[PDB]
Every structure is written in structure tokens, then in C-alpha cells.
Amino acid sequence: NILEALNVRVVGTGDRILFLAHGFGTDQSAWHLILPYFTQNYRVVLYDLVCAGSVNPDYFDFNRYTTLDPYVDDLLNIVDSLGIQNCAYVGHSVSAMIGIIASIRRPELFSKLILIGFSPRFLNDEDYHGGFEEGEIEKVFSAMEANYEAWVHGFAPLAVGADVPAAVREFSRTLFNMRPDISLFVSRTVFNSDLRGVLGLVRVPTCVIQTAKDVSVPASVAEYLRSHLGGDTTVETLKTEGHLPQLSAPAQLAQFLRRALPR
């Protein structure tokens, strides 16, 4: 039922469950280039966040989805529904944030957390560089509301990077598939999140993957995470820019994953 609403799909064969969880602006199809590198050795679970354009917009209850907690409830519901007892989890952007909270709620559930394009807090603070200020983000939210199509038009290449047209085309496609109001509302939710208070409570081994230049995550965030996460943590840096390496640099990302994943 949640399995149907969130387009859960399980493919591959192997002992380890690999759980792939997409971020803002895409759906599980953003994993399609790396997926063949794993389906021979991992039982792979994919799903769409409720805010994905591929999910019936009728399921997006703006009354319910006001913080990340209902999203974590969705993930744990899927995990439980599938009867998954242990898995490796790869979360991009918001799914990274969701993964951290899930790990603290259910520490026995994750063998490993791989976090791509992950920030615990986007807004700056005293001695903390998240990369954004409140005045600044209000204008983005206005632009997103005023003219979503124009925002996407400009944002997709900036976010994804240069000379990767296939990646930009795909990211534009999935952004345009999201309902504009859902896009804005999810953005607001993410920008009002602050995980820095609970990072020390993470116990699961974690790999933080960053790219060279991510418009949403300053380079300094990775070393903050290394110093603040409570598990055994490593940082890997892709020699490639952009926010969506699963589309823009699938070979390098898959290589990093193959190094970091259990088995």
C-alpha cells in the first residue's frame, strides 16, 4: 500500500540489501545509471519520496509533511513492510537527512550509511558555514513561487554542472514533473531543518561523499561532518562538480560505492 503509493521496487539478487534513496527534484530513476553495477551482488530496494513527480500528488498532504519526521516514518514503514532487518543505505540530499534520523531511531537497521550531497543545515550560524542566509533563501522561495518554470530553467544546469547535457536534461525532466507547490514546500521544510544537534548520536558507520563544487553544500561541510558524526566516518571527494553525480558521473560514483559498501 505504501509500497504502491511510493513506487517501491526490489531488483537484483544477493545477501545484502542495498537501499537507494533519491533527493530533491528527482525520483528513483536517478539511480538507473549506477544500478547495473550492483544488481548481480545486491538485492536493491528503490522508492520514491512522497514529493516526487512520479508519485500521485494526492498523497502529498501539506498538513502532514511539515518536518522530516513524517518522511522518516515513510522510510521505516517501507523497511518494516518489506521485512528488512538490516541494510546498507545510500541517501542523496534530503534522503541523507532522512537516513540520519532513521539511523538514530533504529540503529540496528543500517550496516552503513552512504550520504551524498548531504548537509545537516543549509543556513549559516555563528562559526558554522551552511552556505545560505535567510534573506537570500526567501528570494529563492519567491522566485520558485513566482515562476517555477524559469527557476528550473536556470537552476538545473547550475546545480548539475557543465558538459553533462544528458544529466541536465534528466534533472530538468524530473523537476518539471514535480508540482510547483510541492517543490517549494519541500524546499522550505529542508531549509528549516537543523540536524547538527543530533549528529553525535549517530552510531552507524558512515561514508560522506561530496563533489568538488555543490551549489547547496560548501566544501567545509564534509570536514564538519567528520568532526561531528558519532559513528566511524570517512569522507570521499569526487573529482567532478555538481549536485547529482549519480547522473553526471555514474562511473566514478559507482566506484566510490563499490569501495564503501559492505560486501
Author numbering: 5 to 267
Quote the authors verbatim:
The OsKAI2 and AtKAI2 structures were also compared to the analogous receptors for SL signaling in both rice OsD14 (49), and in the model plant Arabidopsis, AtD14. To that end, we determined a new AtD14 crystal structure at a higher resolution (2 Å) than the previously reported structures and was hence applied here for comparative analysis. Structural superposition with OsKAI2 showed an RMSD of 1.2 Å over 265 Cα and 1.2 Å over 264 Cα for OsD14 and AtD14 respectively, and both D14s gave a sequence identity of 56%, confirming high structural similarity in all four proteins examined here. However, there are some clear differences in both the positioning and type of residue found in the pocket when comparing the KAI2s and D14s. Most noticeably, F27/F26 in OsKAI2 and AtKAI2 are shifted by 1.2 Å in respect to the positioning of F28 in both D14s. Similarly, F195 in both KAI2s is shifted into the pocket by 2.7 Å when compared to F195 in both D14s. Furthermore, both KAI2s possess Y125/124 in place of F126 in D14s, with the hydroxyl group reaching 1.3 Å further into the pocket; similarly, both KAI2s possess the larger hydrophobic I194 in place of V194 seen in the D14s. Conversely, we found that A220 in both rice and Arabidopsis KAI2s is replaced with S220 in D14s which is slightly larger and more polar, perhaps indicating a role in strigolactone binding. Collectively, the differences between KAI2 and D14s demonstrate that distinct residues reach further into the pocket in the KAI2s, suggesting an adapted and more compact pocket to better fit KL/SL-like ligands. Generally, SL receptor D14 responds to (+)-GR24 due to its similarity to natural SLs, whilst KAI2 proteins tend to respond to (−)-GR24 more readily.
KAI2 receptors, classified as plant α/β hydrolase enzymes, are capable of perceiving smoke-derived butenolide signals and endogenous yet unidentified KAI2-ligands (KLs). The KAI2-mediated signaling pathway shows homology to another phytohormone signaling pathway, strigolactone (SL), where key proteins involved in KAR signaling (KAI2, D3/MAX2, and SMAX1/2) share sequence and structural similarities with proteins in the SL signaling pathway. The SL signaling pathway comprises a homologous receptor to KAI2, D14 (DWARF14), the D3/MAX2 E3 ligase, and a homologous substrate SMAX1-LIKE 6, 7, and 8 (SMXL) in Arabidopsis or D53 (DWARF53) in rice. When focusing on the binding pocket, several residues including the Ser-His-Asp catalytic triad are conserved in all proteins, highlighting its importance in the catalytic mode of action performed by α/β hydrolases.
